[PDB]
Amino acid sequence: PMVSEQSEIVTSKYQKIAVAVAQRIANGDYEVGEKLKSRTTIASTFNVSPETARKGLNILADLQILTLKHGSGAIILSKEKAIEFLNQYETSHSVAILKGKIRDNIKAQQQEMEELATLVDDFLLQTRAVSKQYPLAPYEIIVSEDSEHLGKSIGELNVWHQTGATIVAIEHEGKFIVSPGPFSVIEQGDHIFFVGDEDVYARMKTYFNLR
Amino acid sequence: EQSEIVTSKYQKIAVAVAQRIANGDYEVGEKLKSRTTIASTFNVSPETARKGLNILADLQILTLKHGSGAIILSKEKAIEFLNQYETSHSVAILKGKIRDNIKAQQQEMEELATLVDDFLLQTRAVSKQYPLAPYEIIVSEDSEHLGKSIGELNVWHQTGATIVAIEHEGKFIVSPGPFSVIEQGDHIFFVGDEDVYARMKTYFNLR
Amino acid sequence: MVSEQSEIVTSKYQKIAVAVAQRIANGDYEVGEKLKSRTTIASTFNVSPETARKGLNILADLQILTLKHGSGAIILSKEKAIEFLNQYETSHSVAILKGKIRDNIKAQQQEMEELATLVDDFLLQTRAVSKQYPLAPYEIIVSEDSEHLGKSIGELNVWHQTGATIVAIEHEGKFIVSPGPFSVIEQGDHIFFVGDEDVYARMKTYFNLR
Amino acid sequence: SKYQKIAVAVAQRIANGDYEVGEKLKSRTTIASTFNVSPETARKGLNILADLQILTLKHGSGAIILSKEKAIEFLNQYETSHSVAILKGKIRDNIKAQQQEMEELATLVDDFLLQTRAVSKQYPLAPYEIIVSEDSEHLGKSIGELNVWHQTGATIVAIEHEGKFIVSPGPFSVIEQGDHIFFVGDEDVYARMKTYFNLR
């Protein structure tokens, strides 16, 4: 019921022979019109039995790469079918090559993430540089659906107290107005322009687009 | 330009005193010092320091309408003000969270690499311990061998696999023989070497 | 860790266990039927009687067999042989790694979702260097001594009288951005504000300059 | 960078309409004094807008503004070409490239994990073992020509011949005396298998 200890687990030798000779055909060592040698001579090539070599060649005969209907030897039929058979048997899709593809993927992504780390470091460097280069350049927030104090005058909202930002412009329903004043009312779906320091966008975010 | 960019001096004072209130140095209802005393504590003008506190007055954290000094109203609102004003979503902290994210992800992908190493070693070592253990594949519709019997399909030639069972339309058949047809949606059980699943895959539902 | 001069193998007794459980579960060994002697099973599997003793003890502990009889082992449950097979497969080494790899992949997808949202929020915080030209600031100087000095901006209702929103004040060499209504105007400051061209003139006429 | 800032500032004025289309600026030194910058730098600052055809300086008297539309174009490209914009785009490209790579990984590990074999679950697919202990009848022939499945209803899955355990041996495989033959089927296929080989 068990594999005998002296018995080594193997696959069918006839398939092995078929693959070897098909590989030679696909390489061109055995040309298309070229015929193979006797059934005993091919056995001598791999030091194997002639009958097993015949079965190996019967595999390729059934796969129509060669024909054995002629006693002189084996005449080759299609090199193109040999390459198709080689691609199919050597699947180039096993768990081994897929491991290599997966390892290549992980290494590429690790390199990309380090690249990302340097990119975001420099992005912070550039936000700190622009805050000094163009200190009056405006920000724009989009007052999204999750909303709390919409429909309220600016003066009543005490915006500057909690955000440190001065509201400078309002796009309300596609209408761009600069310097709107305290009685101006904001609804949802408006673009709000403001000026301040590096963190006023964050403060405006937490204050307006977060309940 | 020819100067140095600075934010509102009053906001800094407001934030400082609000933090002290939130830490508990100035408890609720307790009396504060004069606008001039804390001004000297902060090395600022009494008038500017008063406006710094006027910010918190308008934010209803304290009241100063009694002249004796400033009375604390709610520490709870001071905490809210600190959470809202101080950094909670800036690009500086977000950079740090992003870097923590990428480093954690690097560790996972490294774990993934060792996991796939061990998975290949285990599938190969297990294949010797169970050389007749079956595989199971599902034939999709993208297959040219549909409606054909195993005898002409020459499966063993091209896959090195021995079909042992076929699950066709909810009926499990063991040892089906050449007079069995493969249709879309069948489970095909087979034995072979470690690469036969791949060979079956490309042979049936690929190319 | 496994040395490069070693191998991993499943113990023979476990192989015996699964083999006999498979026979029971497929029905070759009916429930009532007795198994052969511990020595006969050892010879059939070419293993020591002691390893066969471990295999039969495996199925005994799983209540698939009982050995209180010297004649042999009596079959107990066909379904529990199937249960044992279920547990053995799902407990196999490649099964555990299969689950671990799937969990790792799932965790990494969530981490990248978190990353996507974090970089969304990170990237959104950018100020417009030039695209906004109606928001380019204007500049007046408190050059001519005017009125309402030493007062903050909110108490003056500047926007009513000039229609301008102050964005920055340079008071004696300190550039202050977003100074708020509590900020003071003195003589000799650079005053930056936003509005249109008729608001520039209005600011000027308001502060007694032009 | 100060010269770039002046260029942007004056382009902003032109684009907002502060300098009407065709209005003249004063001599470069007069506006340069308005800024806290040297006139020498300001001359290059306006040379920038001259090179982009926002203004012309061939009138020593001063600067003549040309087109508001081209000033806006300059502003748009200036924001896009600023180093904070390009890094933002690069970071977005990096994140999306990694998303696709993980998409690929998701498909690769799916195909990679699918390739497992049922060590114990397929109890109906557990093989039987027959021993050709009696050399008689069907022997020395390939199993495919032997009509094995035809007459026994069994599919041979392994053959142990002379100390070599062969998995999936194929139709071209021959049976000799003393081989262990593994096959799959039912309880009655085991009996039929055995009976077939003049064993019992």
Residue numbers in the entry:
A (entry chain A): 0 to 210
B (entry chain B): 4 to 210
C (entry chain C): 1 to 210
D (entry chain D): 11 to 210
Give verbatim excerpts from the published study on this entry.
BusR is a member of a yet structurally uncharacterized subfamily of the GntR family of transcription factors that downregulates transcription of the genes for the BusA (OpuA) glycine-betaine transporter upon c-di-AMP binding. BusR satisfies the overall domain architecture of the GntR family with its N-terminal winged helix-turn-helix motif (wHTH) and a C-terminal effector binding motif, an RCK_C domain (regulator of K+ conductance). Our structural data, supported by biochemical and biophysical data, reveal that BusR utilizes a unique domain assembly with a tetrameric coiled-coil in between the binding platforms, serving as a molecular ruler to specifically recognize a 22 bp separated bipartite binding motif. Binding of c-di-AMP to BusR induces a shift in equilibrium from an inactivated towards an activated state that allows BusR to bind the target DNA, leading to transcriptional repression.
In order to understand the molecular mechanisms of BusR signaling we crystallized selenomethionine substituted full-length BusR and solved its structure to 2.8 Å resolution by single-wavelength anomalous diffraction experiment. As the protein was recombinantly expressed and purified from E. coli, that lack DAC domain proteins and the entire c-di-AMP pathway, our structure represents the apo state. The asymmetric unit contains the physiological functional tetramer of BusR. The four central αCC-helices of the four monomers constitute a four-stranded coiled-coil motif, thereby forming a robust tetramerization interface. The four monomers are arranged in a 2-parallel 2-antiparallel head-to-tail arrangement, forming an overall shape resembling a dumbbell. The RCK_C domains form a dimer on each side of the BusR dumbbell. Each of these dimers is flanked by the two wHTH motifs of the antiparallel strands. The interfaces between the RCK_C dimer and its neighbouring wHTH motifs differ significantly resulting in two distinct DNA binding domain arrangements that we refer to as wHTHinhib and wHTHfree. The interface between the RCK_C domain and wHTHinhib is approx. 50% larger in buried surface area (wHTHfree: area = 902 Å2 versus wHTHinhib: area = 1353 Å2). Furthermore, in the observed conformation, the DNA recognition helix αG3 of wHTHinhib is buried in the interface and thus incapable to bind to DNA.
